[model samples]
Target chain A: PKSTYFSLSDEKRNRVYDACLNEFQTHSFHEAKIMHIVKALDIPRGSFYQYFEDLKDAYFYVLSQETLEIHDLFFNLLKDNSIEESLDKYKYLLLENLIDSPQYKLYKYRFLDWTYELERDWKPQSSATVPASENDNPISQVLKSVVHNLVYRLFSENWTEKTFIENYDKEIKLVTEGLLNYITD
Target chain B: PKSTYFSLSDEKRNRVYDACLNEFQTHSFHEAKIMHIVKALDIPRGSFYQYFEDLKDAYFYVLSQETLEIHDLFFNLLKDNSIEESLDKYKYLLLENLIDSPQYKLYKYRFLDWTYELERDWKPQSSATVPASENDNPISQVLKSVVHNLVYRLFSENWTEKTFIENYDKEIKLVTEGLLNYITD
Candidate 1:
């Protein structure tokens, strides 16, 4: 049935996508009900499964599509630059994206529900087609840890204060410059 | 009956303390059972409630006593010095306390179960008895957030391969110097 939804007319496909997004935004994966989606769409119960194998499949599909957009935004910033410049560009781009994009709020909530073990388990290892960097700098590992923590805090339900954006920039700058200085020395 | 444990002699009190600590170490709060503790102590189930109002009360008592030692360690470092010196002293002391100390592992697990909202709620308000100078500073806030996140990851089920002691100095130095620069600017 998912194939049917995929092959539907453009207008019909957009309608389904919108309904799925709305359902996910209102409820977490476990709490979301298929009946609610079908009722909201005014579609038969049997037809609901046509679009998704199960709730988990639908949830993952929605998440993948949303996070891909974020990935694209980051990649666009790094199109032509040294690592240092790319990171600097990313900082400003990230700040702007958080503030200007509506998707930021949706993506933020989605990220908070993620567990560290899940991230580790889900990460892809390099294969024959994908080249891996030869560099083994420990600095990058530290920076990655710092960035991941920042993002987690920013999305957490308790993160209501507006001061983090300003604070985060200072933190990033400090770690980046400190790493560079240590490497040079 | 639980209160009867408190009435026991000092020698007996030590046994109760050790038993509770062992139970806490092996399991998260949700998984811990009073029956297991009583069984371990070869005491009746009623004896537990005598010593504690509930599992949480006993837990809080143990935690309060243990954390006081760490609290004193940090406070002693700050007794007579500039904020910068005090923080620098704290960085090494805190790291050592976390990595080498036996109690560190127990404390680490307890910290993971703490909610961000609980931490925020527990923050002391500026009051007449509490010195305003001790209440708020950019450096303190930055260090607190960074350390909290670091410790969370260290005890997390999905911990990265980096050694906790190795990354300690670098992370602390970054937050400290970064805060100074950001505040001055």
Candidate 2:
């Protein structure tokens, strides 16, 4: 949100937030437009920009407010469990928080419609919380790659819960046993 | 392109195509607007829709024409070589085609801006070319996940080419050796 948004009265800001969230719920970010939001609020077009930097700014605000940071669960679990155990537990947590949560459509569009543009602007609240010791571990990188794709497929292919878990099992097994074991002449 | 697009003369269709491509090259799929494209060609808004089903249709056409399917090289190499060998060769292939191509900016927007909305509509020429025997091997899935993230990082994080190859080497090694080897008490 922009400084102008911050300066908005509490009642007006809440109204704007709800309007933006309503638009996102009905349309994917690609299909969302400022014109609709302004029309919905019956405000001048310039007033919309005065509140938020752009559509993306409003979208990010709603996302940060409404959605869970799914990855945080895994890293927190890692503190007390082995990597394999954490992953095993993480699967159920993902299904619960993402699939069973009220924010299902939001997460669905998020997993399906995400691009680098959104990723670049994801941290809308600034970088103070970003740790300097951000781990660049290859193990973490590879695991995230495989898991992220699993979620991508879950949404893109409209997989059942059973399909998602079963595929997760296969992918986790591949990571544990090594890709070399699967290779053959 | 729609049926009407195909019905257009060579000169008119090319003019529309060039205008759409110009919009996508300058802005991401999300940012590229139908208003701008129609403005560029000085065509009526309805005429723009007459040729292409929507903005997405025109964007997909431009992408299909301008970009190489970077995965094809890896799969082709896999026909004769081991998975490890194929990945090794694929690293250089990715760098050469994506980094050294005339379509660098086009491909950059593509890599940086793609979403599932785009992915769903990607095979815009129709599914006649899609094969039933599509490979869905776990090994293939894992390798693609890692490599796809590598390329995603290449564009999103603005990694140097050398940094990309080095990160690629580490990630490929993790997949080949298995994530278990990197684990500890």
Candidate 3:
């Protein structure tokens, strides 16, 4: 568990922390190697077992943490905005903070680079979506997928700011208008 | 006679396709090697190439087919039906068709076990969703992701059909009412 790594002295823990970032962030999911981390950081091989059950425990920890952090960032603008205003504000914020940010590449790799194998192995300790404090897990899931799906679409479709702006408006409208309104009724 | 697997006779293609599904359902994508399907079907190793390019192709083809089947159901209740009426019909249909159908195991493996690798080369050979008529792919994309994410929820969180029914209504309400509708109201 990540708790083991944090329990260490700050000096050692940060090294562990840096090592994880460098490895996971450096390689796409399939290409990422635990040996790369251990060898580069020069941690005892035995210490690896103590750190986690395997590579899975660490990366799942990191991926979930990263997704949660971004989830907050995604919802950061929802507090005081209308539908039109919220989308506009969030669009600029997305380009400025997320697209240009350092964390973008890591998340990009996680999204595009991950495979079925990595997903099969992704056992989060307690998934971030499991709301304990009345956090609205259902909407939490829907919100995350909306943005997360957009990120993958952005990279895969090679869309620019104009496309993101246009498409995000359309999708948010799809929800806002209610699909029922579009039906034969 | 053709590179696309679908060109074959219905009986021949289905038997071959069923063999592929059995292999993938039995193992998560990574462990589902091409050789397993070839050997299980007692076909030549080269026969895999005749059917499609390779294993990812066959599995992706199957995965897309099942997803498109479900996506239709997600929208089926929308036509000629009111919101609450539609949701109930869709809920019963989901239990009967998706959870209880023979396709359940493969879909179970898909939602629970699929990863970025499986997604990496997910090329559909004219997916079933692309209807003969123009159905607006943009909203199609949005509508699908909403329920698709919920599918991931049903298996990953171990929700009963009853819980799925409850949560499905709740999440869809967020869309109908609009998340921003919640902001000031």
Candidate 4:
């Protein structure tokens, strides 16, 4: 049954994809109903299992596709400039991309519903490594962690406003500059 | 019945608190079972209704008590300093306090689970108004968001090792100095 679903024609695959996206947009990953997706696609329940292992597997596929677009946008910006300029460009691009894209609404819901259970269970092959330094300052280390987590929340949370964005940009510039001063001075 | 449970003595209150905590820690707010808490404490199902309005009220009480301790820890460090120094001290105190405390584990879990939902539904009444300036820049605004979210995660997620803390400090410092340079130069 599983093999049969995967071997389906392109028309069937598009129907399945559209159905799954519609279901995910309405509810969180945990609340998403397989029956709803299948019924919406006019497919048998057995066909659902034929294409994917479970809800999570299908959800992950959807997430990967959506996030890949975000990744591509960032990478495209980076292709033309130095790290500093790229970061500067990233700020405006990020705001515009998220606000303008329909996919962002879906991304926002999926991101918020991602629980600690998923974060703990995830083990990516290429993890962000901690940079090593001979002179390791504990205070500086803690501040960096604090800043990183906060930046992530901006993307993941509903703190979207013109004033909020403007103030956030100022704060990040100040903090990054301060770090450079500490290292050099 | 609810009024009767609300009038329980200190000894009985402590027992209920312990039972509720056990339930909250084992599962998320949604998955947590009222029956399980009552059974764990060897009480009848009806007794739960007597003590609290609902599971939400009891859970909020627990959270308020736990998070207050961490907030107090941060404020205590800033009691004697200017706003700038206080912010700096707050970072270090916050980091050390979290890393060294046993309660960090529980605090971390509760923080990650509740932040976005709470941020969306509830706003801080006491939030400080930022003064407008003609020289306002985007970097400063970004840093502020970064700092706010990082602090949120520090208490919410289980961060392993010193890297996160170190980076937090470094990033904040970098941003701070950058802002100064942008204005002065």
Candidate 5:
């Protein structure tokens, strides 16, 4: 998407931005359309192209603006809190910002619906795509695995907000406190 | 797939199974086709339907047979080993069974390509898709999150067997040994 879209006055840019979010929120990536977005915004079709290279570019830009980068979502939790408090804190943040929020479907599609065709246009070609043996920092992996599991449960089950936090606290304690704490006790 | 396919003689059933595996291995779920599978197997078009409801049925059968059931993957680990040993044991089993095996790409595509349509045919209609709080097992959630993390890493990052096993041990240890070990070490 063009950086020049940002140069447009704030009011005009937000109208276009809001429309993209609305269209994408309602539709999976495959179903989302540029025409619908432009029509809804009452912008000329020509103006749509002027801002984005294609539907792919527009979708990417809209998400980049709206969603926290995956790393950033946990970054502050890691930094601000003691290790004891962090995972539980992350759980609250995950539910509040990701699951219950209006953009939930947008995220649902992002996690579950992405395919090679969709991945081709937007994803950076991963350079390592793989290994670093001894240098690995495990706390990062621990955080990631916990998040991946929570997201999977969200898509597969119909857990209420209350049920989710209850489960999150129980599961996370086992990770934070150890199976031995239960065993040794 | 038709239950009658199960009634076929062992030789006949295996040939069909192999043929389905070949087709799926070479193409994504969307690109896989019954026509190509039949052509490769030298089965009649009608015979394909006799064996399967459609391509979806056939593909699902192949995957179900080849892949480890998610729970089974961790089942033995939790049972046969010490709490510390179980996790390290799981890391090897994961690498050998999932990442290093020929079944690797089969899993890569299985995880990556499964979609709404693919899911529609295979998944059971979950009556318990919502909640029964008392029956909720926190351990299953913890176990799932760890596996979810490993699978996410397997596809997103380019990890070699050693790299994957190494990270798996580290991450799983946090769950077993607890984060407090590192924070308080």
Candidate 6:
């Protein structure tokens, strides 16, 4: 976003920001267009550039505001809380911040339309991609790996909140206790 | 693909097939164009339509030929062997079928560029999406969930075969023996 955007009255700036978020909610970044936002706001096409660098600039700004910092929260909780407690509590936060939130549709497109190009370009800012850290524990990585797939399925499969929680519990149980118990042969 | 494609001389068909694979290897389905394929093969644009319905038909055909049936292999192995044994053997196969395969770049594009639209359209035949089954074991779903993330990282992070197997072994160990052992509190 530009200084010009910030210079707008708070009410006007919010209208532009809300329109951008709504565009992303309905269309993936690849499918979103500045023209649509222009029409929605009934603003001149040139007005968009005055506010933001481009569609991606606007998109990233919307993401920064709407999406939760899931990775940060999990790791921070781990600093003072047990892994079991952190993960158990993390599920509810995920539901509230993602599946059941006002931004549900935005998160849907985020997971479904995500590509390597977006991941590469967006990492300098708040990101959906997990950061690689040398000191990060292998255990955290494995746990995250398990939950990441759960989140992917939740969106792609159009899973209900209950369905998401069911899979979450089963998968998290495997993560904590192991799959060997369920593997009877 | 049309009968016209199969009607080509074996060598000619293979040339066209290889060209399509090359296009997908470099460009994702959304980015790939019939124009490039025609230029590479020096064929008329009409010839592309005669051979396949569209770029998607060609992409699906190329995918069918290149990607392995990893899930089928695991489940078949499960029928005759223990989960631990099936998983151990599965790692070697994944290395051969994906990371170390000649189709490495093709698989890379597939994983990195995949979206829900492709998933919905591509699931009628050979697919990357895991099939849901009422009778399927929860244990297998959990195991698959763990490995699915590993495969996504293998492509996105550009992991070496050694790095993939190292992560595989550790994550699979967590799946089998449980993360509780790794959790020190």
Task: State TM-scores per candidate.
Answer: 0.59, 0.70, 0.76, 0.62, 0.85, 0.76
lDDT of 3: 0.69
lDDT of 3 by residue, A62-121 (tens): 777766666555455557765456656766778876677666667778766765456556
User: Which pairs of residues clash in candidate 2, taking residues 3 or more apart in a chain or in different chains?
Assistant: none
Model 5 misplaced stretches (Cα beyond 4 Å):
A69-73, A125-136, A182-185, B69-73, B125-136
Which has the higher TM-score value, candidate number 1 or candidate number 4? Answer: 4
Q: Candidate 6: DockQ?
A: 0.54
Q: Could you give candidate 1's per-residue lDDT for residues A1-185 as a string of tens digits?
A: 36877988899878877777777877755567888888988999888788888766566667766665554555455457754556567666666665455655555555544442333333342122111331123333344455555666666533433555565555566554542342244
lDDT of 4 by residue, B1-185 (tens): 25665578878987888788777766767667889999999888988988877877677666666556655554454457644565577677766766675555555566556544544533341222232431144432443455655655555444544755665665455455553453355
In model 6 chain B, the worst 10-residue window by lDDT is: B127-136
Expressed as tens digits, the lDDT of each residue in B1-185 for candidate 6 is 99999999999999999999889878878889999999999989999999999999999988876653656656667678888988999998787776766667777778777766786678665544344562244575667667877887787677888888898898788778777765543
Candidate 1's C-alpha runs over 4 A off are A1-18, A41-185, B1-15, B60-75, B80-96, B100-135, B156-162, B176-185
Q: Can you list each candidate's DockQ? A: 0.12, 0.49, 0.46, 0.29, 0.61, 0.54
Interface RMSD of 1: 6.8
- For residue B30, model 3's alpha carbon misses the true position, in angstroms, by 4.2
Candidate number achieving the greatest DockQ relative to the actual structure? 5
Error of 1 at A66 (Å): 4.3
Compute the interface RMSD for candidate 3.
Answer: 3.0
What is candidate 2's lDDT per residue for A1-185, written digit by digit as tens?
Answer: 77988898999999988889888877889899999999999999999989888898888877866643566677778789988899999999988987776556777788778887677778445332212343477777788789988887787678899999998898888887677865532
Q: List per-prediction Cα lDDT, in the order shown.
A: 0.59, 0.78, 0.69, 0.59, 0.72, 0.79
lDDT of 3 at A3: 62
Q: How close to the true structure is residue B89 of candidate 2, measured as C-alpha lDDT?
A: 92
lDDT, residue B19, candidate 4: 84
Chain B structural similarity as TM-score, candidate 3: 0.76
Model 3 chain B poorest ten-residue lDDT run: B123-132
- Candidate 3 residue B178 Cα shift, in angstroms, is 2.1
Prediction 1 TM-score vs. true: 0.59
Candidates in descending DockQ order: 5, 6, 2, 3, 4, 1
